[PDB]
């Protein structure tokens, strides 16, 4: 059971970096479900995923505090 | 199918927050594969997962710059 159906299958290992001083919103959600249409950002696609599969995954929230 | 077999299965949706000013080091990896024993941090478990499942997932790297 791989967890990523389609994101960047041209890459051997999908890694994304965030230089945190570059964040502009107070809270910026990052995708941990591999279904987002704006991956690596979270666009709320995890909700449909969780219902479809009885799963409980959600985003990582980067906060400026 | 679901992507998180074992982490915090009692929570309806697993969400984590990071206050970016509180990062301890230059580069901190956060888990996107749901296999880390230090979740939400990445502990390198994605490598074994990718090999076993023919998958290509990896961490989110939070960088101080
Ligand atoms: S869209 Fe993937 S965690 Fe929200
Ligand atoms: S242990 Fe999950 S992405 Fe590294
Ligand atoms: Zn949500
Ligand atoms: Zn790695």
Instruction: Give the atom of ligand 1 at the shortest distance from the alpha carbon of A59.
Output: 3
Which class would CATH give B19-65? alpha beta
- The answer to whether B3 and B37 have CB atoms below 8 angstroms apart is no
CA distance A52 to B55: 21
Provide the resolution (angstroms).
Answer: 1.8
Helix (H, G, I), strand (E, B) or coil at A60: strand
Which helix or strand (DSSP H or E) is residue A58 part of? strand A57-63
Helix (H, G, I), strand (E, B) or coil at B22: helix
Q: Which residues of B32-58 are buried (b: 16+ CB within 10 A; e: fewer)?
A: bbbbbeebbebeebbeebbeeeebbbb
CA of A12 to the centre of ligand 2 (A): 14
Method used to obtain the model: X-ray
Instruction: Give the atom of ligand 1 at the shortest distance from the alpha carbon of A58.
Output: 3
């Amino acid at each position: 059971g791989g967890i990523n159906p389609e994101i960047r299958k041209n890459e051997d290992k999908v890694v994304d970096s965030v230089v945190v001083t570059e964040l502009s919103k107070n809270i910026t959600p990052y995708c941990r479900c591999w279904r987002s249409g704006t991956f690596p950002l979270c666009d709320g696609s995890h909700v449909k995923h969780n219902k479809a599969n009885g799963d409980n995954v959600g985003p990582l929230l980067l906060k400026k505090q």
